[PDB]
Amino acid sequence: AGNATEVPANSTVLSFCAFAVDAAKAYKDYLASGGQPITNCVKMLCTHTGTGQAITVTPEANMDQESFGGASCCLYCRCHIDHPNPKGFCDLKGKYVQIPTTCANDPVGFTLKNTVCTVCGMWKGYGCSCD
């Protein structure tokens, strides 16, 4: 009974990060030891004529980004573990995340390591216009 959510390629990384005390460090260390990035993300078919904003209610990818379903780019959602903020709630689940095409091979790692500019809504170092 039930419906599978995962593929065998993600078993090792997800099992490792599901048991870790510090899952974010565990995933960064997993990648540094040659591990493969988490796959089976929710990639969107979109026009690529979007605003380019980082976290949106609808896909907003521009010509230099891929849009993904937010929960699928969140290590804590992928591993079904606690979220690190005090309220234990997610900021990606329920939204779409725009990832630069250059970093689209690892959406989970990109969101773990990067920050959204609170002023212009673009990723810092990847489209954030202000200094």
Partner 1 sequence: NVTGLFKDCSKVITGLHPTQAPTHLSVDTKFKTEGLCVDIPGIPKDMTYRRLISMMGFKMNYQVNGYPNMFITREEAIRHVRAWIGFDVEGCHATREAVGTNLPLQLGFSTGVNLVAVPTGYVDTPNNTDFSRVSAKPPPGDQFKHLIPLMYKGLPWNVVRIKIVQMLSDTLKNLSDRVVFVLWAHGFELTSMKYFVKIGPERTCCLCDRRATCFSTASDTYACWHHSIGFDYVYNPFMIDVQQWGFTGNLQSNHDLYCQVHGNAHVASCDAIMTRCLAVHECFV
Ligand X SMILES: Cn1cccc1C(N)=O
Annotated binding site for Zn(2+): which residue ranges?
74, 77, 83, 90, 117, 120, 128, 130
Residues 6+ apart with CB under 8 A from 44: 59, 61, 66, 67, 68, 69, 96
- Region 1-60 residues binding ligand X, contact defined as CB under 6 A: 3, 5
Min CB(3)–ligand X separation in Å: 3
**125 lies in the site for partner 1, by CB under 8 A:** no
Q: Which does residue 28 bind out of partner 1, ligand X, Zn ion, none, counting CB within 5 to 8 angstroms by kind?
A: none
Give dist(CA 55, CA 40) in Å, integer: 20
How would you label 3-19 residue by residue, b for 16+ Cβ within 10 Å and e otherwise? eeeeeeebeebbebbee
Residue 128 binding target from Zn ion, ligand X, partner 1, none, CB below 5 to 8 Å by type: Zn ion
**Complex with ligand X: residue 52 or 70, whichever CB lies closer:** 70
Check if the beta carbon of residue 73 is closer than 8 Å to that of residue 110: yes
Binding residues vs ligand X (CB under 6 A): 3, 5
